[PDB]
Design an enzyme around this catalytic site. Structure first.
Site, PDB file in Angstrom:
ATOM      1  N   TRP A  13      -9.449   6.049  -0.940  1.00  0.00           N
ATOM      2  CA  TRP A  13      -9.460   6.712  -2.125  1.00  0.00           C
ATOM      3  C   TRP A  13      -8.582   6.332  -3.148  1.00  0.00           C
ATOM      4  CZ3 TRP A  13      -8.703   9.532   2.135  1.00  0.00           C
ATOM      5  CH2 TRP A  13      -7.592  10.177   2.543  1.00  0.00           C
ATOM      6  N   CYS A  46       0.877  -1.207   0.007  1.00  0.00           N
ATOM      7  CA  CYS A  46       0.042  -0.125   0.230  1.00  0.00           C
ATOM      8  C   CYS A  46       0.761   1.285  -0.041  1.00  0.00           C
ATOM      9  CB  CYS A  46      -0.970  -0.115   1.146  1.00  0.00           C
ATOM     10  SG  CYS A  46      -2.115   1.536   1.200  1.00  0.00           S
ATOM     11  N   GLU A 102      -4.310   4.167 -10.787  1.00  0.00           N
ATOM     12  CA  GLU A 102      -5.111   2.858 -10.498  1.00  0.00           C
ATOM     13  C   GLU A 102      -6.275   2.742 -11.810  1.00  0.00           C
ATOM     14  OE1 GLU A 102      -5.885   1.259  -6.530  1.00  0.00           O
ATOM     15  OE2 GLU A 102      -5.492   3.310  -6.247  1.00  0.00           O
ATOM     16  N   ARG A 129      -0.068   4.877   2.865  1.00  0.00           N
ATOM     17  CA  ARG A 129      -0.089   4.354   4.117  1.00  0.00           C
ATOM     18  C   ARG A 129       0.267   5.576   5.362  1.00  0.00           C
ATOM     19  NH1 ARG A 129       4.171  -0.481   4.546  1.00  0.00           N
ATOM     20  NH2 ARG A 129       4.310   0.039   2.487  1.00  0.00           N
TER      21      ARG A 129
HETATM   22  C1  HEM Z   1      -6.154   6.516   1.690  1.00  0.00           C
HETATM   23  C2  HEM Z   1      -5.914   6.374   0.635  1.00  0.00           C
HETATM   24  C3  HEM Z   1      -5.376   4.918  -0.214  1.00  0.00           C
HETATM   25  C4  HEM Z   1      -4.817   4.849  -1.298  1.00  0.00           C
HETATM   26  C5  HEM Z   1      -4.460   6.074  -2.041  1.00  0.00           C
HETATM   27  C6  HEM Z   1      -4.286   3.342  -1.419  1.00  0.00           C
HETATM   28  C7  HEM Z   1      -3.397   2.929  -2.628  1.00  0.00           C
HETATM   29  C8  HEM Z   1      -3.314   1.735  -2.918  1.00  0.00           C
HETATM   30  C9  HEM Z   1      -2.676   1.209  -4.178  1.00  0.00           C
HETATM   31  C10 HEM Z   1      -2.328   1.990  -5.139  1.00  0.00           C
HETATM   32  C11 HEM Z   1      -2.484   0.092  -3.718  1.00  0.00           C
HETATM   33  C12 HEM Z   1      -1.865  -1.035  -4.835  1.00  0.00           C
HETATM   34  C13 HEM Z   1      -2.945  -1.899  -5.262  1.00  0.00           C
HETATM   35  C14 HEM Z   1      -2.782  -2.444  -6.509  1.00  0.00           C
HETATM   36  O1  HEM Z   1      -2.674  -1.886  -7.518  1.00  0.00           O
HETATM   37  O2  HEM Z   1      -2.777  -3.767  -6.662  1.00  0.00           O
HETATM   38  C15 HEM Z   1      -2.887  -0.326  -2.428  1.00  0.00           C
HETATM   39  C16 HEM Z   1      -2.744  -1.660  -1.879  1.00  0.00           C
HETATM   40  C17 HEM Z   1      -3.515  -1.829  -0.590  1.00  0.00           C
HETATM   41  N1  HEM Z   1      -3.974  -1.295   0.284  1.00  0.00           N
HETATM   42 FE1  HEM Z   1      -4.052   0.679   0.114  1.00  0.00          FE
HETATM   43  N2  HEM Z   1      -4.873   2.693  -0.370  1.00  0.00           N
HETATM   44  C18 HEM Z   1      -5.360   3.707   0.568  1.00  0.00           C
HETATM   45  C19 HEM Z   1      -5.903   3.253   1.531  1.00  0.00           C
HETATM   46  C20 HEM Z   1      -6.079   2.033   2.317  1.00  0.00           C
HETATM   47  C21 HEM Z   1      -6.672   1.548   3.433  1.00  0.00           C
HETATM   48  C22 HEM Z   1      -7.850   2.436   4.190  1.00  0.00           C
HETATM   49  C23 HEM Z   1      -6.469   0.207   3.715  1.00  0.00           C
HETATM   50  C24 HEM Z   1      -6.971  -0.877   4.685  1.00  0.00           C
HETATM   51  C25 HEM Z   1      -7.646  -0.374   5.827  1.00  0.00           C
HETATM   52  C26 HEM Z   1      -5.589  -0.099   2.738  1.00  0.00           C
HETATM   53  C27 HEM Z   1      -5.162  -1.478   2.593  1.00  0.00           C
HETATM   54  C28 HEM Z   1      -4.201  -2.002   1.440  1.00  0.00           C
HETATM   55  C29 HEM Z   1      -3.809  -3.222   0.977  1.00  0.00           C
HETATM   56  C30 HEM Z   1      -3.850  -4.518   1.980  1.00  0.00           C
HETATM   57  C31 HEM Z   1      -3.263  -3.385  -0.040  1.00  0.00           C
HETATM   58  C32 HEM Z   1      -2.626  -4.362  -0.423  1.00  0.00           C
HETATM   59  C33 HEM Z   1      -3.538  -5.182  -1.382  1.00  0.00           C
HETATM   60  C34 HEM Z   1      -2.940  -6.387  -1.837  1.00  0.00           C
HETATM   61  O3  HEM Z   1      -1.978  -6.941  -1.281  1.00  0.00           O
HETATM   62  O4  HEM Z   1      -3.776  -7.045  -2.722  1.00  0.00           O
HETATM   63  N3  HEM Z   1      -5.313   1.018   1.956  1.00  0.00           N
HETATM   64  N4  HEM Z   1      -3.117   0.789  -1.629  1.00  0.00           N
HETATM   65  C1  LIG Z   2      -7.938   0.543   0.055  1.00  0.00           C
HETATM   66  C2  LIG Z   2      -7.457   0.641  -1.198  1.00  0.00           C
HETATM   67  C3  LIG Z   2      -7.346   1.914  -1.821  1.00  0.00           C
HETATM   68  C4  LIG Z   2      -6.646   2.100  -3.407  1.00  0.00           C
HETATM   69  N1  LIG Z   2      -6.626   3.248  -3.679  1.00  0.00           N
HETATM   70  N2  LIG Z   2      -6.578   0.994  -4.012  1.00  0.00           N
HETATM   71  C5  LIG Z   2      -6.609  -0.272  -3.535  1.00  0.00           C
HETATM   72  C6  LIG Z   2      -6.169  -1.376  -4.137  1.00  0.00           C
HETATM   73  C7  LIG Z   2      -6.473  -2.576  -3.556  1.00  0.00           C
HETATM   74  C8  LIG Z   2      -6.003  -3.960  -4.720  1.00  0.00           C
HETATM   75  C9  LIG Z   2      -5.591  -4.910  -4.020  1.00  0.00           C
HETATM   76  N3  LIG Z   2      -5.216  -6.004  -4.895  1.00  0.00           N
HETATM   77  C10 LIG Z   2      -5.436  -5.925  -6.202  1.00  0.00           C
HETATM   78  C11 LIG Z   2      -6.050  -4.965  -6.848  1.00  0.00           C
HETATM   79  C12 LIG Z   2      -6.278  -4.676  -8.261  1.00  0.00           C
HETATM   80  N4  LIG Z   2      -4.883  -5.111  -9.100  1.00  0.00           N
HETATM   81  C13 LIG Z   2      -6.334  -3.642  -5.834  1.00  0.00           C
HETATM   82  C14 LIG Z   2      -6.986  -2.856  -2.463  1.00  0.00           C
HETATM   83  C15 LIG Z   2      -7.304  -1.707  -1.760  1.00  0.00           C
HETATM   84  C16 LIG Z   2      -7.023  -0.449  -2.196  1.00  0.00           C
HETATM   85 CL   LIG Z   3      -9.718  -0.710  -8.760  1.00  0.00          CL
END
Ligand code: HEM
Ligand SMILES: Cc1cc(N)nc2cc(-c3cncc(CN)c3)ccc12
Ligand SMILES: [Cl-]
Ligand code: HEM
Ligand SMILES: Cc1cc(N)nc2cc(-c3cncc(CN)c3)ccc12
Ligand SMILES: Cc1cc(N)nc2cc(-c3cncc(CN)c3)ccc12
Ligand SMILES: C[C@H](O)[C@H](O)[C@H]1CNc2nc(N)[nH]c(=O)c2N1
Ligand SMILES: [Cl-]
Ligand SMILES: [Gd]
Ligand SMILES: [Zn+2]
Lengths: 404, 402
Positions: A280, A108, A285, A111
């Site tokens: 958000w 993420c 993405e 964070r």
């Molecule tokens: C606040 C704005 C946030 C932004 C801009 C953001 C952005 C992102 C992005 C770009 C990814 C990469 C996902 C992908 O393309 O595969 C990601 C992954 C992830 N986010 Fe964040 N996120 C946000 C909030 C959060 C929140 C609130 C949580 C949980 C409470 C969270 C938990 C995760 C987790 C666990 C992943 C890894 C997902 C995976 O391994 O499949 N995120 N995030």
């Molecule tokens: C909270 C949150 C915010 C954000 N902007 N993107 C997320 C993207 C994912 C996400 C995780 N694994 C795979 C994908 C798609 N390749 C997306 C999960 C959570 C997200």
């Molecule tokens: Cl998405």
């Protein structure tokens, strides 16, 4: 204690936090598996030690260890498991563990926000229609008319005996994907499977490319049943370009709220198979991955034709040129629509500040380089030049088999 | 139990059985991944030797034959008598090709069998070395129609010091520190520029001053050598539509010839073996010109493009960078100098991965280095999972000899 360097500035730090990783990962001295999306494959005795460690960091973070107020909490947990084989989390602990799982999510990039999270406690959940009402409360609170607010809703934990709660959709908002005599797809190809499950469970198919799917919700042991989201609870954004007037005519849209509803929340040895979180969007993405991946909406050549670009030769960088405009349109459209979004430059810069924050706080941060670096303009962001250590800490979000 | 590798654009799945014989070990553990870090006596030399000879006799479809067991016994007896051994020429040619083939961060490996090997193992002085190097540069450059070459200098041997080339590449631009504390020219080369100065180089003061060579003959201090202006083919940079771009005075050179890596073949070590190919345009346009600690022209180009640099959401950086890459590709094609864009390059690396899986059952690949620095997921290697591991023969990094 691995030595980590930043090549843009020359600074060195050591990652002491890595030494506390336990859940081993996929890589070995022989070969690196860092680029694999799902690493490896997806008598409670061990439940106690996980619970103990979590409680020790809870009371480490807040107040006091030593003749404190949590050997009591240490005693109540081991008495709880002794009695029933599982235990319950204090609401503040569930809150703290929810924040930590976000804080520990190596992939993420947002964070820097991990301290601001709204933990809805849905643990007294009993049926699908009730779940659906939690999911709708979340969605309304998260969306907030476009002023987005991070939120997670925790449904009842897994409990040995009977089945668990389960959101069958990968997100709370997903666009349908339909097939043809071509075998081609109208709508999102990422959601071709779940689209036919909704159909085989009674849902009537739709017009085409941007039909929001119904929700397949599953109470313990019961078969799932469909739920239709109120079209006023699903804020969407029509995509328009600031200067390419014809872009609006392409009819592209995306939704406001990224809400992942298929991952598993593990806190102190407890497993929450349904704990949907939302934040958000980072703009890339939507513009780069969702709209331009060859196996997603795959619009790149369509936009380059409209821009009149030289698609006859790769060296004109027509792909690069059209992908940038698609992203400019995403950012523009979300801002005009007053919907929270963040561009890959602002985001990566914030994540560097997170890294220095986490360096002083915990002596490191787990970060998965291949997912932190944005999918356009990688080396234009500072994360590209920052070496990174990847490892598993608990609490964690973890992938899980999907309910088929 | 071999890693399962998926291509997400297509749905392909393969298994990397070749990783199983990865002869050296890296920096990753099951505790923690360090993939993103840039810099991760008798019968042990014999075991690498026997393995390499086993490799060589397998490629010439003669495994386990008469000529094979003899060469093993030859090499074994030679290490007993001399502590080292000598490659035959055909082995050196094969060893140098495998080293390229095995290099996990090289996206240009589709070409690995098209490699011109110059054997300079009879080199005697720094002066002869210089002559061999001018020949390499002349042959590789070939008037802008570049060819892959490597010149192999004498192996590390007991009793004598190493041959070393001190320059990281044969062609590099000066970097002068200054009054502002700023650097003029290429900041990545300030140290070698300081070494050339203090070894007798009269420094210029431009931004694109080609550095002299510092060449080390065994047990000798390095010697300065100037490259003749006419050997170093350069390319003025202009943009096909932004006509003010040629007024930035930017140039880059034709030939990327890396000179500071160590070539290892069957336990034998060649600390001096410069090798050259042709550029991919992102190395120049994106990294060399836009890295904030390199020439760092991105803002000055974005201002010249009348982009809005006050806010990041205009994506002015992405826009200026893409036009810099356009200008680099335009300029190289205009000057008739070989160059490959990152779309063509990555598409051919995919073909390389398919060739390699059929031939050896896998392919060492460093994803973070294979994916280009701009437009990453626009290229097919982004959606390809990969397995990074170290096979020998190989190029390795080595310390700076100062
Ligand atoms: C606040 C704005 C946030 C932004 C801009 C953001 C952005 C992102 C992005 C770009 C990814 C990469 C996902 C992908 O393309 O595969 C990601 C992954 C992830 N986010 Fe964040 N996120 C946000 C909030 C959060 C929140 C609130 C949580 C949980 C409470 C969270 C938990 C995760 C987790 C666990 C992943 C890894 C997902 C995976 O391994 O499949 N995120 N995030
Ligand atoms: C909270 C949150 C915010 C954000 N902007 N993107 C997320 C993207 C994912 C996400 C995780 N694994 C795979 C994908 C798609 N390749 C997306 C999960 C959570 C997200
Ligand atoms: Cl998405
Ligand atoms: C013919 C065209 C070639 C192309 C297009 C090409 C492309 C590339 C690129 C883009 C990189 C990564 C550069 C970076 O770190 O930013 C690289 C690395 C590398 N290449 Fe190739 N290359 C070519 C020829 C060769 C040859 C002829 C050899 C050896 C005989 C070679 C061996 C290597 C090695 C060892 C690396 C890793 C460099 C390092 O570890 O620092 N390449 N190549
Ligand atoms: C033969 C060859 C061709 C080419 N087009 N690029 C190379 C780039 C390198 C290289 C080595 N170390 C560092 C870098 C930049 N971080 C690049 C080495 C050889 C190359
Ligand atoms: C993680 C990562 C991935 C990648 N493909 N290249 C990197 C290149 C560097 C890097 C290497 N040598 C010199 C520099 C000066 N920019 C940067 C640092 C990290 C990198
Ligand atoms: C094969 C490769 O590891 C895979 O496509 C990953 C790379 N990095 C990524 N990074 C993000 N943020 N999201 C992704 O889906 C991916 N995909
Ligand atoms: Cl270079
Ligand atoms: Gd013009
Ligand atoms: Zn690894």
């Amino acid at each position: 204690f691995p030595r980590v360097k930043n090549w843009e500035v020359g600074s060195i730090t050591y990652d002491t936090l890595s030494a506390q990783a336990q859940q081993d990962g996929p890589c070995t001295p022989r070969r690196c598996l860092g680029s694999l999306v799902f690493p490896r494959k997806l008598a409670p005795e061990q439940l106690l030690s996980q619970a103990r460690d979590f409680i020790n960091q809870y009371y480490s973070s807040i107040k006091r260890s030593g003749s404190q107020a949590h050997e009591q909490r240490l005693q109540e947990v081991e008495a709880e498991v002794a009695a029933t084989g599982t235990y319950q989390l204090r609401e503040s602990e569930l809150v703290f563990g929810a924040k930590q799982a976000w804080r520990n999510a190596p992939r993420c990039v947002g964070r820097i926000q991990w301290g601001k999270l709204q933990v809805f406690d849905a643990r007294d959940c009993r049926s699908a229609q009730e779940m659906f009402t939690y999911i709708c409360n979340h969605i309304k609170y998260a969306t907030n008319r476009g002023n987005l607010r991070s939120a997670i809703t925790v449904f009842p934990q897994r409990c040995p005996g009977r089945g668990d709660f389960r959101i069958w959709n990968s997100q709370l908002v997903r666009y349908a994907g339909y097939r043809q005599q071509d075998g081609s797809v109208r709508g999102d190809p990422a959601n071709v499977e779940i689209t036919e499950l909704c159909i085989q469970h009674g849902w009537t198919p739709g017009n085409g490319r941007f039909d929001v799917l119904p929700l397949l919700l599953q109470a313990p042991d019961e078969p799932p049943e469909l739920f239709l989201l109120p079209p006023e609870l699903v804020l969407e954004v029509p995509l328009e370009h600031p200067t390419l007037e014809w872009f609006a005519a392409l009819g592209l849209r995306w939704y406001a709220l990224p809400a992942v509803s298929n991952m598993l929340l593990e806190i102190g040895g407890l497993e929450f198979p349904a704990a949907p979180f939302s934040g958000w969007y980072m703009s890339t993405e939507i513009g780069t991955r969702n709209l331009c991946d060859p196996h997603r909406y795959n619009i790149l050549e369509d936009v380059a034709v409209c821009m009149d670009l030289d698609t006859r030769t790769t060296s004109s960088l027509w792909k690069d040129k059209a992908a940038v405009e698609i992203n400019v349109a995403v950012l523009h459209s979300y801002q005009l629509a007053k919907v929270t979004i963040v561009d890959h430059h602002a985001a990566t810069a914030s994540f560097m500040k997170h890294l220095e924050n986490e360096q002083k706080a915990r002596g490191g941060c787990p970060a998965d380089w291949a997912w932190i670096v944005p999918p356009i303009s990688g080396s234009l962001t500072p994360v590209f030049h920052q070496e990174m250590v990847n490892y598993f800490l608990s609490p964690a979000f973890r992938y899980q088999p999907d309910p088929w």
